[PDB]
Amino acid sequence: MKQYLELMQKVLDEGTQKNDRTGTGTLSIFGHQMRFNLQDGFPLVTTKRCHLRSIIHELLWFLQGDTNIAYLHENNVTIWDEWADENGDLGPVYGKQWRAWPTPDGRHIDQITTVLNQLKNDPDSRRIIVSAWNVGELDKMALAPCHAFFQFYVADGKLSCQLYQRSCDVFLGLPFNIASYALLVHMMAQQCDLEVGDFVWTGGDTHLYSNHMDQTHLQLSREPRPLPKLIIKRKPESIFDYRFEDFEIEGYDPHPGIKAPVAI
Amino acid sequence: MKQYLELMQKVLDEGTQKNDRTGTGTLSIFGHQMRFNLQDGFPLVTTKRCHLRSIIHELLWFLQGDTNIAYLHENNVTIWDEWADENGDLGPVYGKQWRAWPTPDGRHIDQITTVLNQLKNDPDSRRIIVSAWNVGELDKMALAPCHAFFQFYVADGKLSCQLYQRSCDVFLGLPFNIASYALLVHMMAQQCDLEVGDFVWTGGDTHLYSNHMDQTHLQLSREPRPLPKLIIKRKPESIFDYRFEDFEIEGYDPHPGIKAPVAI
Ligand SMILES: [N]C1=NC2=C(C(=O)[N]1)N([C]1F[C@@]13=[C]N([C]1[C][C]([O])[C]([C]OP([O])([O])=O)O1)C(=O)[N]C3=O)[C]([C][N]C1=[C][C]=C(C(=O)[N][C]([C][C]C([O])=O)C([O])=O)[C]=[C]1)[C][N]2
Numbered sequence: 001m002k003q004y005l006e007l008m009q010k011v012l013d014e015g016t017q018k019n020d021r022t023g024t025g026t027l028s029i030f031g032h033q034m035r036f037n038l039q040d041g042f043p044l045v046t047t048k049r050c051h052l053r054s055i056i057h058e059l060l061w062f063l064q065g066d067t068n069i070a071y072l073h074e075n076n077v078t079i080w081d082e083w084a085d086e087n088g089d090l091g092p093v094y095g096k097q098w099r100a101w102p103t104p105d106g107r108h109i110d111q112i113t114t115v116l117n118q119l120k121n122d123p124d125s126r127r128i129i130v131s132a133w134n135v136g137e138l139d140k141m142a143l144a145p146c147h148a149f150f151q152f153y154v155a156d157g158k159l160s161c162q163l164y165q166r167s168c169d170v171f172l173g174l175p176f177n178i179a180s181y182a183l184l185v186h187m188m189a190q191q192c193d194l195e196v197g198d199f200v201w202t203g204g205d206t207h208l209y210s211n212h213m214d215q216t217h218l219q220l221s222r223e224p225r226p227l228p229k230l231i232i233k234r235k236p237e238s239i240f241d242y243r244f245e246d247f248e249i250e251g252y253d254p255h256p257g258i259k260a261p262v263a264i
Numbered sequence: 265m266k267q268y269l270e271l272m273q274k275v276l277d278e279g280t281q282k283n284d285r286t287g288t289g290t291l292s293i294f295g296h297q298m299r300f301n302l303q304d305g306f307p308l309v310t311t312k313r314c315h316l317r318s319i320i321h322e323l324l325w326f327l328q329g330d331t332n333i334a335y336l337h338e339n340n341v342t343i344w345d346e347w348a349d350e351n352g353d354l355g356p357v358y359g360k361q362w363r364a365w366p367t368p369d370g371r372h373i374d375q376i377t378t379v380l381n382q383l384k385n386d387p388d389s390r391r392i393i394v395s396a397w398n399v400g401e402l403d404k405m406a407l408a409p410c411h412a413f414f415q416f417y418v419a420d421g422k423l424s425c426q427l428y429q430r431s432c433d434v435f436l437g438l439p440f441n442i443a444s445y446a447l448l449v450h451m452m453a454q455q456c457d458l459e460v461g462d463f464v465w466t467g468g469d470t471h472l473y474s475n476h477m478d479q480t481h482l483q484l485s486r487e488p489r490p491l492p493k494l495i496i497k498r499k500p501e502s503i504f505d506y507r508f509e510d511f512e513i514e515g516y517d518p519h520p521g522i523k524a525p526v527a528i
């Protein structure tokens with residue numbers, strides 16, 4: 001996609017070499033913002049084939065409040081394997097904060113349901129937020145939330161959302177994050193009877209791993225094809241009732257896939 | 265400042281009329297990003313005179329972990345008056361989350377001290393964050409955090425910071441937020457022996473109240489003067505030991521102040 005290849009190039013032209021947790025080394029920029037009008041198409045990268053099955057199920061997994069990779073495995077999704085414990089546990093990552101943020105006073109907050117209530121009763125609210133950065137539980141998570149806080153906004157009968165992604169692997173991670181969030185906006189909007197607006201992505205440390213340079217030059221030489229169209233076939237009773245089979249991505253014709261190693 | 269007047273104009277040209285909590289009405293845009301290189305000057309608005317005494321003390325107040333407006337009053341700062349309870353309490357707003365985020369398990373996390381430790385021992389970390397959005401305590405805060413999550417970044421021996429501000433009153437609020445955060449970056453960098461890099465501001469619902477339109481046209485007609493220079497006179501032993509008198513803003517010569525009513 002135009003904006004994504006423009007991010008890649010900018011990392012190439014402006015990133016400074018940085019050491020990283022994984023010991024891999026990256027080219028890094030701090031602070032970037034891009035916007036996707038969802039009415040133009042489903043922002044799924046076309047310059048490389050993206051694994052939709054993985055993107056969809058990770059989202060559905062988050063929405064169930066699950067942190068065990070079992071449901072993923074059941075579905076042949078193996079992207080969270082390197083971080084899971086002996087039992088397939090990741091700790092209180094995404095799903096748990098989204099669906100049951102534990103309170104000092106021993107309560108559990110379902111931020112997703114809170115959001116639905118605000119979108120249905122107070123659409124102009126400037127406080128419609130979901131946060132996965134629960135400071136009192138970071139020590140228990142296998143990985144700190146990469147996509148860590150997002151805000152919804154309604155204007156003109158359209159639903160928009162902004163994500164703050166603190167750390168972004170541009171090659172592997174980004175294509176997934178973008179589609180994933182675009183998907184959630186489409187789901188929330190159907191549930192709330194709104195049209196989709198914009199997906200605004202904001203990044204903190206946005207980087208290219210050093211062992212993804214060939215993969216990058218490769219992709220940078222391909223021309224973006226037209227964005228597909230997302231079709232949601234049925235309207236579940238709740239945000240918690242979508243099924244993989246309810247989604248249809250129409251006219252996705254990507255260039256071929258590019259393998260790249262994941263940094264652990 | 266150039267970037268700030270450009271934001272104001274864009275709100276004017278592109279904002280859609282929106283109802284708001286306060287019942288005032290605004291012109292609103294969703295998603296905006298601006299960057300300030302701190303080496304160019306202290307980003308204090310010049311097209312209107314800003315009250316530095318208020319900006320400085322609010323910051324020092326946050327750093328003490330205080331949520332009672334008493335210290336402010338002692339110092340002739342009255343900007344938090346409309347929201348304080350009978351006792352001058354605001355609830356667990358900013359200072360409390362920054363210095364003592366209460367954990368499910370009954371612990372208190374000092375995110376500020378955690379940050380210092382990460383900047384001194386792991387500068388390349390992509391997890392140096394302070395969050396005031398404690399979901400389990402929003403119901404107790406007088407106002408939900410407007411500036412709600414910020415991230416630090418080190419590259420090339422320079423310290424950068426990105427703020428996610430969920431809601432922004434462009435006229436009253438922004439000039440204060442910008443200077444405030446620029447100030448904290450200068451303080452952290454002195455404590456860590458780094459040079460200042462960039463201040464990246466990212467906004468969610470960025471708006472102009474409807475009863476600030478005259479004030480806006482007025483300011484928009486003034487030409488920005490040169491940015492002042494911040495001088496920090498001494499190096500306290502800790503981030504918690506700065507005093508008002510330790511800061512000097514050199515060459516601040518603003519156009520005159522513009523009064524505008526605050527929306528409650
Ligand atoms: N390196 C890495 N790691 C990880 C990831 C990535 O992406 N990369 N992921 C993701 F949560 C997340 C994060 N991120 C990143 C950022 C950084 O770089 C990291 C972290 O670190 P710190 O240090 O900062 O903390 O990470 C991002 O970006 N985002 C987000 O969200 C996870 C996992 N996931 C995944 C993986 C992998 C994949 C692949 O490979 N894919 C492929 C295929 C498909 C199949 O399955 O086959 C393609 O695409 O091709 C995906 C996903 C965690 N970790």
Ligand SMILES: [N]C1=NC2=C(C(=O)[N]1)N([C]1F[C@@]13=[C]N([C]1[C][C]([O])[C]([C]OP([O])([O])=O)O1)C(=O)[N]C3=O)[C]([C][N]C1=[C][C]=C(C(=O)[N][C]([C][C]C([O])=O)C([O])=O)[C]=[C]1)[C][N]2
Pocket residue numbers: 126127285286314315318341342343344347407408409410411431432433434436437438440441521522523524526527528
């Ligand atoms: N309206 C309003 N309110 C408030 C404020 C403002 O600004 N405005 N502040 C600020 F925390 C904060 C917030 N913000 C805002 C956003 C919105 O609009 C609001 C909230 O709502 P929601 O609904 O969203 O929740 O708010 C922002 O922006 N930011 C931030 O941070 C506070 C208080 N503060 C203040 C006030 C006032 C002032 C003034 O007036 N100043 C003047 C003067 C000085 C002396 O003092 O004189 C000038 O500047 O001229 C300041 C500050 C809270 N609330």
